[PDB]
Subunit: 216 residues, 3 copies
Amino acid sequence: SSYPIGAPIPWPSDSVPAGFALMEGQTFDKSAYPKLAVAYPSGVIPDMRGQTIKGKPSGRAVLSAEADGVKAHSHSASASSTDLGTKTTSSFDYGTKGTNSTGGHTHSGSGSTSTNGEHSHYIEAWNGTGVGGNKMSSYAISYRAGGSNTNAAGNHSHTFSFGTSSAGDHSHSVGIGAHTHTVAIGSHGHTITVNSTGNTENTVKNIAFNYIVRLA
Amino acid sequence: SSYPIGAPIPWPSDSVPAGFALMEGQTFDKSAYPKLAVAYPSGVIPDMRGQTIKGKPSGRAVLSAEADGVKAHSHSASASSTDLGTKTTSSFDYGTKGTNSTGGHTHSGSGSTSTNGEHSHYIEAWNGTGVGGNKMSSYAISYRAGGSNTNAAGNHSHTFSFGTSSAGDHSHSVGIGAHTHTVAIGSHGHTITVNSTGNTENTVKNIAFNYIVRLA
Amino acid sequence: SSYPIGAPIPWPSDSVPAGFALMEGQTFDKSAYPKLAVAYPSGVIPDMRGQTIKGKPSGRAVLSAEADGVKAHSHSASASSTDLGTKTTSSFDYGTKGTNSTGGHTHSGSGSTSTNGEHSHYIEAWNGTGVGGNKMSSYAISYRAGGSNTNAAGNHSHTFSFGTSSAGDHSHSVGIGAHTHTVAIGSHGHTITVNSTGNTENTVKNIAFNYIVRLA
Ligand SMILES: [Fe+2]
Ligand SMILES: [Fe+2]
Ligand SMILES: [Fe+2]
Ligand SMILES: [Fe+2]
Ligand SMILES: [Fe+2]
Ligand SMILES: [Fe+2]
Ligand SMILES: [Fe+2]
């Protein structure tokens, strides 16, 4: 025969011709169909529904099934740059600080006192002839007759004591200035999830036929 | 027939033997070709170019077309870790600060004045007999005849007044010290783009034949 | 002939019928197989092992081979949000600062001295008639005869100088206060790697048959 019994035939109609059967995985009687049994010694006609025919390679058995499966491949990919913006730090408060204690000191001073001390002294007078010497006599006093000086006397000093007026009230400036800090951010990553793409089946362009087989 | 009319025949040449026709989508005459009309009641031969044959599953009509399509799948993916390094804060300027006002005080002093005040007194002298008593007589003064003292006098004080020398210029130190801050960085993501991989069509290893069909 | 010589036949058995040959890429005797020579003018039967038949599309020669290949597709993807947390800045040390120099001043003061300076004076006495006037005579002094005063004298002042007691030790407070900074984080991204998914080959659901061909 030009097309041997048992070879699958692609049939374009749901009306199956007399003498043929749909290939649907069914058993048959090997005694009743001796030529079909040459093609299928198991006595089972393969289920061809949803199947494509592939020429048997080395490493695969005849009538073995193979699932659909996508070929190994990957993808290039990239992530958008993200700007994290500006952040504000916690507040630090230096409060109020004290200075060291300093400023103990003395002053010096000099001057003149006021002018004072004007005075006179009393002198005992004596009279009566017979005795002379030493004492002031007032024997003859009718008219002025000039005058004269005591000897010198009266060198002296005084002590002084004082508290001063209150002074010295003051303040200072202190230049503090400006500063910055650094902040180490360190390292980080993210978890990447790639979503599914595709159909329930892997397919190529195909037209549907009913696989049939000649019984005898 | 061992291969019924209407079943597709894969043919290895571009020369189509007489009695057969290339399956190209063409309409045919159903009265001229009634056995072909049994297989193709619509009067149209399917266009098999670029097509593979698939056995018809439940849920698909005989001769329905199915496009090529990749099977549902995803990929695992990862993001490299990134070191953000070190960031500098803004500058804060404390400028110059002023202290409180303090340091009002007094001093005391004491001592002695210089020794001064030596002096003598003039005494009015009188002369001439007939009057006596009280006053100083200069009646007889030819030669020295001792001497004597006045009574005591002369107790007194003085006032004083002064400004002092300038003193008290000084400075202080002030311990400021060190500080840190904390800063909250927060959260972020990235937009992930995955590029296309693959061909115009989804294909399997295939050899090209011309599908032809027997007419009668 | 209902299936012409040279058309490939899917055979379900490893035992090939007599008068057919596995399509394995072999050459053939063109004179001995003249109808086969019309189907295959090259004298070569194509290798059908691992092959699917596809209908010859335009732009492609009959019996040419086509490799398996995934259809162009991509995937959506996403990256998880990452909290970078709280970071501590570097420590900044203002250390110890100095103030400006100020505080130079004077004080005033006033008061009275102690009361001192009581004294008397010696007076020289003279005697002997023949000279008169001016000087103190002691001619006649037997009994007391009242007394009189010297003239006024003795106005004077003194100088003083001193160092004062120690005073003026003190300190100040200075309000510094609180501050924060801002910190610009800048931008970053990540290298994204997508891993391979799939099998050695692109496949659809298939059953393996031995492609054979009728010789004569
Ligand atoms: Fe002072
Ligand atoms: Fe700071
Ligand atoms: Fe993919
Ligand atoms: Fe005096
Ligand atoms: Fe005095
Ligand atoms: Fe001070
Ligand atoms: Fe990131």
